[PDB]
Amino acid sequence: AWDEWSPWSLCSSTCGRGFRDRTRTCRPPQFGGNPCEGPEKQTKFCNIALCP
Ligand SMILES: *[C@@H]1O[C@@H](C)[C@@H](O)[C@@H](O[C@@H]2O[C@H](CO)[C@@H](O)[C@H](O)[C@H]2O)[C@@H]1O
Ligand SMILES: *[C@H]1O[C@H](CO)[C@@H](O)[C@H](O)[C@@H]1O
Ligand SMILES: *[C@H]1O[C@H](CO)[C@@H](O)[C@H](O)[C@@H]1O
Secondary structure: OEOOOOOOOOOOOOOOEEEEEEEEOEOOOOOOOOOOOOOEEEEEEEEOOOOO
């Protein structure tokens, strides 16, 4: 089982296309659990302003 996501980062670009990301680690293993392979990162597109 997965632990909670971290907050999203800010957009890596202050204008134009960039990335934002967040990460999570595994919860401690339990008897019978499906093994979790950690850490995991989620990345998405962002664009916060048009560049000059
Ligand atoms: C963040 O604020 C924006 C309003 C711009 O001033 C950014 O500077 C511009 O950033 C782009 C993308 O990294 C570069 O291509 C330009 O060289 C730069 O003027 C600022 O980082
Ligand atoms: C991260 O993603 C969402 C919150 O944005 C929820 O499913 C849960 O908090 C998860 O850790
Ligand atoms: C990232 O995205 C939103 C805020 O933009 C929230 O669900 C939370 O802050 C998450 O980390």
